[PDB]
mmCIF file with all atom_site columns, C-alpha atoms and ligand atoms in Angstrom:
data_model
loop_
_atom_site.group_PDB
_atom_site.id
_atom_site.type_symbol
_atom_site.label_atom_id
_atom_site.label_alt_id
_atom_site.label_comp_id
_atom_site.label_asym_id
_atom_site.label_entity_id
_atom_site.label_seq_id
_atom_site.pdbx_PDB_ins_code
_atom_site.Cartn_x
_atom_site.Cartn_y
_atom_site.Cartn_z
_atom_site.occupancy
_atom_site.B_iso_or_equiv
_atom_site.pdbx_formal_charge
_atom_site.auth_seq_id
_atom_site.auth_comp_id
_atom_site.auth_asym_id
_atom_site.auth_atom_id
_atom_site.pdbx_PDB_model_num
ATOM   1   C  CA  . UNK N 1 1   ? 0.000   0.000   0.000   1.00 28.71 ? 1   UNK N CA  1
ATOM   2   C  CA  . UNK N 1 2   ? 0.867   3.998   -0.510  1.00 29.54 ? 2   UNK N CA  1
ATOM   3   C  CA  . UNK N 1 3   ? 2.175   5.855   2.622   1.00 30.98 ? 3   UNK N CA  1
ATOM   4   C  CA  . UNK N 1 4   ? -1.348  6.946   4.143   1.00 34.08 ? 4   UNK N CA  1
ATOM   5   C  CA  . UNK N 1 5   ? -2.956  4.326   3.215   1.00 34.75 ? 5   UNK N CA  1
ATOM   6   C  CA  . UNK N 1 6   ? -3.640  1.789   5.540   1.00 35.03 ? 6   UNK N CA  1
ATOM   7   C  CA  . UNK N 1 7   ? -3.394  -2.382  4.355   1.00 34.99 ? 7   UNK N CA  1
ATOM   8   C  CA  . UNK N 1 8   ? -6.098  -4.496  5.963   1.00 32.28 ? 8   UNK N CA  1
ATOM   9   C  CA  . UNK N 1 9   ? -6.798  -8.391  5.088   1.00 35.45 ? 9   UNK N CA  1
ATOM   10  C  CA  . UNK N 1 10  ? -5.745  -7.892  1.042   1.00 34.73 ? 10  UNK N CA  1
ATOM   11  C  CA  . UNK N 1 11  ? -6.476  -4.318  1.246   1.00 34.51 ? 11  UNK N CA  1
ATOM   12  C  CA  . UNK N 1 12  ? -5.950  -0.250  1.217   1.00 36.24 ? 12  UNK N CA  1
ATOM   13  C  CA  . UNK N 1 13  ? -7.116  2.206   2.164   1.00 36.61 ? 13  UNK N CA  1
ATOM   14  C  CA  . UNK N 1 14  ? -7.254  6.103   2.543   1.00 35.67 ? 14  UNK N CA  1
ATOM   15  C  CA  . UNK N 1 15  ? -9.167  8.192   4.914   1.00 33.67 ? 15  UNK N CA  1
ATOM   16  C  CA  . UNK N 1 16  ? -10.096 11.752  4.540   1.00 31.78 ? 16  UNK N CA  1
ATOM   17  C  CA  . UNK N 1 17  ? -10.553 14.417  6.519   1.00 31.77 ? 17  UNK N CA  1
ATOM   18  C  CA  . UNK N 1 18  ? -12.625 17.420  5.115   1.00 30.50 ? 18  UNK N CA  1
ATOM   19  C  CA  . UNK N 1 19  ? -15.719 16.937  3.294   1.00 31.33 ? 19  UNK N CA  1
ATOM   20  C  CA  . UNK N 1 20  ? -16.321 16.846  -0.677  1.00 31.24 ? 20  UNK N CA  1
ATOM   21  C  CA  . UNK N 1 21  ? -19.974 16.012  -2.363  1.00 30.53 ? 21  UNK N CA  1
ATOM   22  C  CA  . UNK N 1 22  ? -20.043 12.173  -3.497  1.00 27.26 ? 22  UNK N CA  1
ATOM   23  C  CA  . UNK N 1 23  ? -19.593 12.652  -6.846  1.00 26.74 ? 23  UNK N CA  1
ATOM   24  C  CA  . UNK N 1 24  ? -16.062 14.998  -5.840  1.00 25.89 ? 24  UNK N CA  1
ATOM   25  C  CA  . UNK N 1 25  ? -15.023 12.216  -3.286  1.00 25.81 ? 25  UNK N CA  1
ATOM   26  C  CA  . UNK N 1 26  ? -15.600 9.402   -6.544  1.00 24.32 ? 26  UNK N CA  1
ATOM   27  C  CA  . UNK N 1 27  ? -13.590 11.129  -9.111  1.00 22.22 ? 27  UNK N CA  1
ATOM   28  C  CA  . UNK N 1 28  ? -11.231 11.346  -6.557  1.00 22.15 ? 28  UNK N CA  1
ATOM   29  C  CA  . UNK N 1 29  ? -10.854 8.034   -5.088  1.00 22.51 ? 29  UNK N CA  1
ATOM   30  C  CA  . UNK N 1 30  ? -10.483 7.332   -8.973  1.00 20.09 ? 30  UNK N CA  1
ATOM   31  C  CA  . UNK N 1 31  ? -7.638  9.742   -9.357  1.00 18.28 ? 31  UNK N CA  1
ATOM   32  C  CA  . UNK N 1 32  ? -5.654  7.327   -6.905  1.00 16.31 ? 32  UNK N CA  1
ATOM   33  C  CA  . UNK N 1 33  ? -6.226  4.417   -9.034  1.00 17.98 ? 33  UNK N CA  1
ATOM   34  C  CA  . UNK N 1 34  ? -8.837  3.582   -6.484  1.00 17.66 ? 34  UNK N CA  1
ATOM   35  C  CA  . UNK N 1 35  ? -12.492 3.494   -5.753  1.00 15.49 ? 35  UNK N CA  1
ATOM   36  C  CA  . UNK N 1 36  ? -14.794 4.071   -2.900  1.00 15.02 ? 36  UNK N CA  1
ATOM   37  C  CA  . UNK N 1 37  ? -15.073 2.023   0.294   1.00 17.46 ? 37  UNK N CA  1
ATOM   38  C  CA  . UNK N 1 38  ? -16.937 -1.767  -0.950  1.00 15.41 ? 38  UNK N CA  1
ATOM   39  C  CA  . UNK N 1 39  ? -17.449 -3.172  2.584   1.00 14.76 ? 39  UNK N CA  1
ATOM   40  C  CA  . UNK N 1 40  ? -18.134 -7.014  1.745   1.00 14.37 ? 40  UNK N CA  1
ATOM   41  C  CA  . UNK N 1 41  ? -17.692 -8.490  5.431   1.00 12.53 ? 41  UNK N CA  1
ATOM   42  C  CA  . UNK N 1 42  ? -18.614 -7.954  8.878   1.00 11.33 ? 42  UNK N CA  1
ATOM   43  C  CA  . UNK N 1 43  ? -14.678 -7.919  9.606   1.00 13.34 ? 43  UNK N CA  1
ATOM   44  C  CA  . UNK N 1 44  ? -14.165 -4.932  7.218   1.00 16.32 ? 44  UNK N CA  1
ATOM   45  C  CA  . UNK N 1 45  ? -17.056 -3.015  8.514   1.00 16.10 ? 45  UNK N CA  1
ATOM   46  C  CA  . UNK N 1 46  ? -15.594 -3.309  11.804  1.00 16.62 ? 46  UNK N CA  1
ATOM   47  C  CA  . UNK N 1 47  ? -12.209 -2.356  10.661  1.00 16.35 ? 47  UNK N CA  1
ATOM   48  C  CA  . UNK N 1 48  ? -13.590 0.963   9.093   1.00 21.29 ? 48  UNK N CA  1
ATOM   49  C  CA  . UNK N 1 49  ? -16.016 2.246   11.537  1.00 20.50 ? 49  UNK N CA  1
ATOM   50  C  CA  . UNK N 1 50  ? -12.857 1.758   13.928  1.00 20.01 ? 50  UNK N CA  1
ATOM   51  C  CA  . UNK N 1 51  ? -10.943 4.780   11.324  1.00 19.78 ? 51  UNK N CA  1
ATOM   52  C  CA  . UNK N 1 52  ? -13.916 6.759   10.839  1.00 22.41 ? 52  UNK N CA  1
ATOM   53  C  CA  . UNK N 1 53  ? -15.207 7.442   14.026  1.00 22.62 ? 53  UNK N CA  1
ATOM   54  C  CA  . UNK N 1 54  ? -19.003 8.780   14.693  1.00 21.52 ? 54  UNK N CA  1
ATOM   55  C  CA  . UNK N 1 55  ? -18.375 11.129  11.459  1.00 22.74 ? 55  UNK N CA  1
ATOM   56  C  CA  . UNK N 1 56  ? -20.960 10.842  8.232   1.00 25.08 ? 56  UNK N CA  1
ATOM   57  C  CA  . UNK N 1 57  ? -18.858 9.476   5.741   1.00 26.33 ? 57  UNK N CA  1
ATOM   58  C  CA  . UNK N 1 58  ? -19.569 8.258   2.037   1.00 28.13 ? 58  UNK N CA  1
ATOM   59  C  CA  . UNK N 1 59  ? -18.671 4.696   0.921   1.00 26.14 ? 59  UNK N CA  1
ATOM   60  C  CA  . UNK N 1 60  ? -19.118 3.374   -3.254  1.00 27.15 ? 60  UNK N CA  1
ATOM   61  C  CA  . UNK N 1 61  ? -22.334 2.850   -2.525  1.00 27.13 ? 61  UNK N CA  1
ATOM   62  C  CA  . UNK N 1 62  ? -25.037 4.520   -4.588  1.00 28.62 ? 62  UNK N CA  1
ATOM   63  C  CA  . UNK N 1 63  ? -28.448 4.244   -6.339  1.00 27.30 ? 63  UNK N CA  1
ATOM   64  C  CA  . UNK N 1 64  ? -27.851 7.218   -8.631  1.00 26.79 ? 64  UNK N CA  1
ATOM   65  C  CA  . UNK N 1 65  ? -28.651 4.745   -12.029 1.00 25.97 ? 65  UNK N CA  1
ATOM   66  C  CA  . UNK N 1 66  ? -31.210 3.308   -10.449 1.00 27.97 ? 66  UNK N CA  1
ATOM   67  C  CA  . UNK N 1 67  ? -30.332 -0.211  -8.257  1.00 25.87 ? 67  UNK N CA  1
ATOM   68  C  CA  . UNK N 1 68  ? -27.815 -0.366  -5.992  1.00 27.87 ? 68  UNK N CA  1
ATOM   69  C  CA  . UNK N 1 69  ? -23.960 -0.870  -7.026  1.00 25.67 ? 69  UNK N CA  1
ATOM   70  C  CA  . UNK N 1 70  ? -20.809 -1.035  -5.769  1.00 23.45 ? 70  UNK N CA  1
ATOM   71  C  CA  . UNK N 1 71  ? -18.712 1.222   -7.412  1.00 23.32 ? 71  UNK N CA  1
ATOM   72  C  CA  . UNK N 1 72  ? -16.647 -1.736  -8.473  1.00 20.68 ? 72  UNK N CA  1
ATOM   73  C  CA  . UNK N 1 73  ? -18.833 -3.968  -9.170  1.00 21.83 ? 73  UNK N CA  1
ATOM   74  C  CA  . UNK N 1 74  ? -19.259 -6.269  -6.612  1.00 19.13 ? 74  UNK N CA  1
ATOM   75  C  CA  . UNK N 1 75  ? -22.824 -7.707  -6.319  1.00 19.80 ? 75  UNK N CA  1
ATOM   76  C  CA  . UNK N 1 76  ? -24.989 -5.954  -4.155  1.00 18.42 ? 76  UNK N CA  1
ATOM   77  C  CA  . UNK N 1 77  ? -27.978 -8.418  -3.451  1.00 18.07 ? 77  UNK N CA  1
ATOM   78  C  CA  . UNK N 1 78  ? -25.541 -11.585 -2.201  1.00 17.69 ? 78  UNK N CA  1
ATOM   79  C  CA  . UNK N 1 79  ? -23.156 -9.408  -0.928  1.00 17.18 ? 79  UNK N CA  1
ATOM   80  C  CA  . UNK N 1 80  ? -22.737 -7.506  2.920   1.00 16.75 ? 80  UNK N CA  1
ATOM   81  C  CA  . UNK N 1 81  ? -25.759 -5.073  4.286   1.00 16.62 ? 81  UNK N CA  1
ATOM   82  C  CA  . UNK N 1 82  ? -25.458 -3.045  7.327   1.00 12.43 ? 82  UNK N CA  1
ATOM   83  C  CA  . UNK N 1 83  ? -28.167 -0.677  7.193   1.00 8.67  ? 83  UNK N CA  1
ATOM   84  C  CA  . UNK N 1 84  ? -29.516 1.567   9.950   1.00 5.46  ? 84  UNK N CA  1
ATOM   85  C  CA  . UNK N 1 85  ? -32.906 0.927   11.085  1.00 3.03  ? 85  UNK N CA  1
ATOM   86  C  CA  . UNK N 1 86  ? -35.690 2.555   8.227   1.00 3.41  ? 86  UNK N CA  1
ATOM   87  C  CA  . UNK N 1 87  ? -33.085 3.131   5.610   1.00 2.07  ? 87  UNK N CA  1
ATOM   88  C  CA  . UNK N 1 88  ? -32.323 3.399   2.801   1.00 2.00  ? 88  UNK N CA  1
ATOM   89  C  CA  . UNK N 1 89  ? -35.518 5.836   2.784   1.00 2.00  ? 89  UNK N CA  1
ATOM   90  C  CA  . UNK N 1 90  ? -34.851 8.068   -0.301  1.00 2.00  ? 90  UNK N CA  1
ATOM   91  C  CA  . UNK N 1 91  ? -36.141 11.558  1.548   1.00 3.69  ? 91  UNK N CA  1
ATOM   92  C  CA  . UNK N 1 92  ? -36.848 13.989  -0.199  1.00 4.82  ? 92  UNK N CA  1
ATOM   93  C  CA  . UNK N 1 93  ? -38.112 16.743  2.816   1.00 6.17  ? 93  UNK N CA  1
ATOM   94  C  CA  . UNK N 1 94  ? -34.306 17.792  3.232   1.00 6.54  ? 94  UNK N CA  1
ATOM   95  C  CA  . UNK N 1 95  ? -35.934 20.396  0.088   1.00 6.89  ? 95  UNK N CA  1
ATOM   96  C  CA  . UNK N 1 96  ? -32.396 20.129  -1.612  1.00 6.35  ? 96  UNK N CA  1
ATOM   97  C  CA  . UNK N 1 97  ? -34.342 18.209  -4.745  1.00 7.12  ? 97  UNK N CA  1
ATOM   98  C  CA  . UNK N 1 98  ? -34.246 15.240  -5.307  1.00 11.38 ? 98  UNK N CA  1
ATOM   99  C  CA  . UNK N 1 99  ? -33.931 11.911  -3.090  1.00 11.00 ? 99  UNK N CA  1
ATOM   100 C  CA  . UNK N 1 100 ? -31.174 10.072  -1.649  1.00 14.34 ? 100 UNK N CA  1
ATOM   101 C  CA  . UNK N 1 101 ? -28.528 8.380   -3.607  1.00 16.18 ? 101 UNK N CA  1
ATOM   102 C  CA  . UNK N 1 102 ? -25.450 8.091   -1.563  1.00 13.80 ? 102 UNK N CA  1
ATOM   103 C  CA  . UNK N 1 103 ? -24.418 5.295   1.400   1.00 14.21 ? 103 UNK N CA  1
ATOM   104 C  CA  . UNK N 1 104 ? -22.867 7.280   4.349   1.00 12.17 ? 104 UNK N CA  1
ATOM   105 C  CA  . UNK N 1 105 ? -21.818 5.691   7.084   1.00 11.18 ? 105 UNK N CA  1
ATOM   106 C  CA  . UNK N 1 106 ? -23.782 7.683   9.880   1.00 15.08 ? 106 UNK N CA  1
ATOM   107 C  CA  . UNK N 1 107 ? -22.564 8.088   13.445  1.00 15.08 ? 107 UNK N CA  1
ATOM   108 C  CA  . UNK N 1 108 ? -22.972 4.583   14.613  1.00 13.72 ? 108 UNK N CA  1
ATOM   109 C  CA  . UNK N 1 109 ? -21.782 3.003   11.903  1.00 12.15 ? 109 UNK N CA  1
ATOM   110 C  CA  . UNK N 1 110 ? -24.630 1.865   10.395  1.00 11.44 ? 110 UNK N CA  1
ATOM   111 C  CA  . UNK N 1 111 ? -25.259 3.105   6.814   1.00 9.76  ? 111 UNK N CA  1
ATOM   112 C  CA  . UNK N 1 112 ? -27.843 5.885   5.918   1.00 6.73  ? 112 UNK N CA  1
ATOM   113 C  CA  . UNK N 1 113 ? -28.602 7.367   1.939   1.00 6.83  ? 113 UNK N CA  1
ATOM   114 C  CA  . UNK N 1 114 ? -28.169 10.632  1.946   1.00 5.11  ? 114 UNK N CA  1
ATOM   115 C  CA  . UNK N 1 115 ? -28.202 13.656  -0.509  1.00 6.12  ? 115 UNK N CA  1
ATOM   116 C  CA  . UNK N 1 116 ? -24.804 12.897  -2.949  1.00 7.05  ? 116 UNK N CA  1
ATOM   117 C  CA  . UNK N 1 117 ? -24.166 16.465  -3.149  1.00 5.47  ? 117 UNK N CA  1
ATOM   118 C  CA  . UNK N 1 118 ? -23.599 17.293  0.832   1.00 8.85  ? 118 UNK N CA  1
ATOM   119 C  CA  . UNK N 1 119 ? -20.274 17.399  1.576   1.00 11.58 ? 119 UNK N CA  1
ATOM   120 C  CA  . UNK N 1 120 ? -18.897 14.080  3.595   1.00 10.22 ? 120 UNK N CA  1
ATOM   121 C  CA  . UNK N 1 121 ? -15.622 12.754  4.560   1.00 11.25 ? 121 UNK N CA  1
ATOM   122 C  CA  . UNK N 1 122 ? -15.176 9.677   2.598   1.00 15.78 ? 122 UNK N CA  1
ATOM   123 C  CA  . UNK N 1 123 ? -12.916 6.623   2.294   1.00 17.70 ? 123 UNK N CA  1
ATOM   124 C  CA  . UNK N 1 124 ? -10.784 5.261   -0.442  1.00 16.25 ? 124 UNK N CA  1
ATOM   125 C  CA  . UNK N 1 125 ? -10.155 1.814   -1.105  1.00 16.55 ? 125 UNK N CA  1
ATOM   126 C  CA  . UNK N 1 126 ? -7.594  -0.423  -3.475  1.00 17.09 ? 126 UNK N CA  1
ATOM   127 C  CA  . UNK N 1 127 ? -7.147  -4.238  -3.579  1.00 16.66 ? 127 UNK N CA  1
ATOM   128 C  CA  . UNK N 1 128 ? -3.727  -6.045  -3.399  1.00 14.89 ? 128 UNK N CA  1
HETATM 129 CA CA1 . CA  L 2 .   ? -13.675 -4.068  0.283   1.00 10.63 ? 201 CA  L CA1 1
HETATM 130 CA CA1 . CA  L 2 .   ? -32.230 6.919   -4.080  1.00 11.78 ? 202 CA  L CA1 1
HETATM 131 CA CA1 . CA  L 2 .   ? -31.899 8.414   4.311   1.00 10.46 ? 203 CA  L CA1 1
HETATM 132 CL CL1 . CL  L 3 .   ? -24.785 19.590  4.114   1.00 9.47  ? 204 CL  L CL1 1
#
């Protein structure tokens, strides 16, 4: 892995800290020859709520095309789900327009959708 980035069972990956909208935090996960957080396992949940912290933070998680992909690919329907209670809920009372097409982790952990264009920390993620 790079310097900053930090190797977990096969894996890297990069932290932020300051906020970009979804869409910002993709192209530049992508910039780094990376992609956005695909948690696939209980273990690698765990392992980034532990860097995170209680801080809203976007993973490559997103219905913006309609069903819900990993950025990567990796299936969504077989694969790992950790959704907070009620969600995904696509709201559309924030009054911003529009739903919610981004996975955040919230506070506890567990993941919320939220308005892509808000401005999140987010997490990037490369495999060995
Ligand atoms: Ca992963
Ligand atoms: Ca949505
Ligand atoms: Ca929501
Ligand atoms: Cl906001």
């Amino acid at each position: 892995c790079p310097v900053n980035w930090v190797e977990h069972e096969r894996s890297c990956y990069w932290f932020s800290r300051s906020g970009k909208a979804w869409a910002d935090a993709d192209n530049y996960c992508r910039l780094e020859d990376a992609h956005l957080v695909v948690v696939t396992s209980w273990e690698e949940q765990k392992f980034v709520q532990h860097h995170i912290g209680p801080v809203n933070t976007w993973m490559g998680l997103h219905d913006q095309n309609g069903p819900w992909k990993w950025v990567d690919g990796t299936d969504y329907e077989t694969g790992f789900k950790n959704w907070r209670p009620e969600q995904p809920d696509d709201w559309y009372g924030h009054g911003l327009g529009g739903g919610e097409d981004c996975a955040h982790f919230t506070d506890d952990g567990r993941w919320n959708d939220d308005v892509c264009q808000r401005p999140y920390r987010w997490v990037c993620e490369t495999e060995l």
